[PDB]
Enzyme design. Structure first.
Site, PDB file in Angstrom:
ATOM      1  CG  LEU A  19      -8.405  -5.205  12.393  1.00 31.00           C
ATOM      2  CD1 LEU A  19      -9.469  -4.262  12.341  1.00 31.00           C
ATOM      3  CD2 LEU A  19      -8.903  -6.760  12.480  1.00 31.00           C
ATOM      4  CB  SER A  21       0.493  -2.065   8.108  1.00 36.46           C
ATOM      5  OG  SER A  21       1.255  -0.967   8.198  1.00 36.46           O
ATOM      6  CB  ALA A  23       0.425   5.050   4.295  1.00 36.15           C
ATOM      7  CG  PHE A  24       1.122   7.839   7.402  1.00 33.40           C
ATOM      8  CD1 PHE A  24       2.355   8.422   6.898  1.00 33.40           C
ATOM      9  CD2 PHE A  24      -0.172   8.217   6.315  1.00 33.40           C
ATOM     10  CE1 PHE A  24       2.480   8.966   5.830  1.00 33.40           C
ATOM     11  CE2 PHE A  24       0.156   8.871   5.367  1.00 33.40           C
ATOM     12  CZ  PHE A  24       1.544   9.370   5.112  1.00 33.40           C
ATOM     13  CE  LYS A  46      -4.850   5.542  10.078  1.00 36.75           C
ATOM     14  NZ  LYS A  46      -5.408   5.882   8.789  1.00 36.75           N
ATOM     15  CG  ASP A 138      -4.822   5.683  -0.657  1.00 37.99           C
ATOM     16  OD1 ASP A 138      -4.802   4.952  -1.622  1.00 37.99           O
ATOM     17  OD2 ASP A 138      -4.040   5.291   0.418  1.00 37.99           O
ATOM     18  NE  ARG A 142      -4.330   0.827  -0.392  1.00 36.44           N
ATOM     19  CZ  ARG A 142      -4.027   1.182  -1.601  1.00 36.44           C
ATOM     20  NH1 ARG A 142      -3.958   0.213  -2.697  1.00 36.44           N
ATOM     21  NH2 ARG A 142      -3.647   2.208  -1.869  1.00 36.44           N
ATOM     22  CG  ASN A 143      -8.298   3.008   1.758  1.00 35.15           C
ATOM     23  OD1 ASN A 143      -7.965   2.432   2.888  1.00 35.15           O
ATOM     24  ND2 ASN A 143      -7.395   3.399   0.889  1.00 35.15           N
ATOM     25  CG  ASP A 156      -7.783   5.311   6.125  1.00 38.52           C
ATOM     26  OD1 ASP A 156      -8.649   5.628   6.980  1.00 38.52           O
ATOM     27  OD2 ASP A 156      -6.661   4.531   6.263  1.00 38.52           O
TER      28      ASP A 156
END
Ligand SMILES: *CCC(=O)Nc1cc(Nc2nccc(-c3cn(C)c4ccccc34)n2)c(OC)cc1N(C)CCN(C)C
Ligand SMILES: O=C(Nc1nccs1)[C@@H](c1cc(F)ccc1O)N1Cc2ccccc2C1=O
Length: 271
Positions: A19, A21, A23-24, A46, A138, A142-143, A156
Site C-alpha cells: 500500500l 511506506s 517512516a519505519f 505494517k 505526527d 496522510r495519517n 499512527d
C-alpha cells in the site's frame, strides 16, 4: 488488558500487495486468516524495518497493548502483532485510503458539507486522544484514513515515542525544542485542515525544511485557502500561534466546526 491485542503467527496472515511506506516500515494490503476459523479478513499489515528500535520485543509488546485499547469511532486501533526478528502490526483495512489521496482523487465532487464534517471528526478523534493522555506527534492528512467517505479515523499516534522528522507539520516549539504536547498537536491539526481546504496541496511547497523555522519566526504562515471565508482561516491561523497555550483546544475546535457544519455554504465558497 492482554485480551484486546491479537498475538498472531506467521501463517495467520498473508501479504497481497504494497500500500505504501511509513517512516519505519512498509504497509501491505493483506488477509488475516485466524487459526481454526473459516474467515479471511482484509487487513493492513505494517512490517517494521529490523533493528530500527533499541527496545526489545518485550517492551514493544507492552506498548502495543496500549494501542489495542483505544475505543473511539475516529481513532484507529491495533488489531494484532507478530514478534519475530521484526515486528509486524495488523490493523483493519480502510478501503478508501488516506484522506490526502482521497481529496486529491475526488477534488471535483467534494462540497462544503464533507469538508466541515471531516474537520469535526478529526477534532473528535484528537480530543479523545488528549483525554487518554496520548500525544500524536505526527498528525497530517496522510495519517487520516477513510473507512467510508464520511467516516474517518486517525492513525499512527505515539509512533516515535514507542520505538526523518516531519518539519512542515510541526509546531515551532517542537522544531526548536523537541517539545510535543496536545497543543503541539493543535498546530498540526491546523496544517491538516489546510491540506483539506486546498484539496491536498503541499504545505510550504518548494521551500526546504531547513528554512521552515526561519519562515515561522519571521511571522509567515500558510496562505489563506481560496474556498475559506475569513471566519474559517482565522481559526486555523490561531492554531499557529507561537504560544501553544493561546491556541484553541480540541474541545473548542469541535464546537466551532460543528456550528459551521450547520451552514456550510456560509463558511466555504466552492464552485
Ligand atoms: C496517504 C496514505 C494511504 O493510506 N493510502 C492508502 C491506504 C489504504 N488502506 C490502509 N488501511 C489501513 C492503514 C493504512 C496505512 C497506514 N499507514 C501508516 C500507511 C502508510 C502507507 C500506506 C498505507 C498506510 N492504509 C488503501 O487501501 C485500499 C489504499 C491507499 N492508497 C490511496 C493507495 C496508494 N498506493 C496503492 C499507491
Ligand atoms: O500499527 C500501526 N499502524 C499500521 N498501519 C498499517 C498496519 S498497522 C501503528 C498504530 C496503529 C494504531 F491502530 C494506532 C496507533 C498506532 O501508532 N503502530 C502501533 C504500534 C505498536 C508498537 C510498535 C509500533 C507500532 C505502530 O507503528
Amino acid at each position: 488488558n492482554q485480551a484486546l491485542l491479537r498475538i498472531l503467527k506467521e501463517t495467520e496472515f498473508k501479504k497481497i500487495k504494497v500500500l505504501g511506506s511509513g517512516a519505519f516500515g512498509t504497509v501491505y494490503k493483506g488477509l488475516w486468516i485466524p487459526e481454526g476459523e473459516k474467515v479471511k479478513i482484509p487487513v493492513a499489515i505494517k512490517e517494521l524495518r529490523e533493528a530500527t528500535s533499541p527496545k526489545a520485543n518485550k517492551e514493544i509488546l507492552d506498548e502495543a497493548y496500549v494501542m489495542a485499547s483505544v475505543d473511539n469511532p475516529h481513532v484507529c486501533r491495533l488489531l494484532g502483532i507478530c514478534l519475530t526478528s521484526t515486528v509486524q502490526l495488523i490493523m483493519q483495512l480502510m478501503p478508501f485510503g488516506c484522506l490526502l489521496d482521497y481529496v486529491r482523487e475526488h477534488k471535483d465532487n467534494i462540497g462544503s458539507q464533507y469538508l466541515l464534517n471531516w474537520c469535526v471528526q478529526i477534532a473528535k478523534g484528537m480530543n479523545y486522544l488528549e483525554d487518554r493522555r496520548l500525544v500524536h506527534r505526527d498528525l497530517a492528512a496522510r495519517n487520516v484514513l477513510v473507512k467510508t467517505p464520511q467516516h474517518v479515523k486517525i492513525t499512527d499516534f505515539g509512533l516515535a515515542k514507542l520505538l526523518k522528522v516531519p518539519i512542515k507539520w510541526m509546531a515551532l516549539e517542537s522544531i526548536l525544542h523537541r517539545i510535543y504536547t496536545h497543543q503541539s498537536d493543535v498546530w498540526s491539526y491546523g496544517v491538516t485542515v489546510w491540506e483539506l481546504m486546498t484539496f491536498g496541496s503541499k504545505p510550504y511547497d518548494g521551500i526546504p525544511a531547513s528554512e521552515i523555522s526561519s519562515i515561522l519566526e519571521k511571522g509567515e504562515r500558510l496562505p489563506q485557502p481560496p474556498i475559506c471565508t475569513i471566519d474559517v482561516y482565522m481559526i486555523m491561523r490561531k492554531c499557529w500561534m507561537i504560544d501553544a497555550d493561546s491556541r484553541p483546544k480540541f474541545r473548542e475546535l469541535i464546537i466551532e466546526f460543528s456550528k459551521m457544519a450547520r451552514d456550510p455554504q456560509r463558511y466555504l465558497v466552492i464552485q
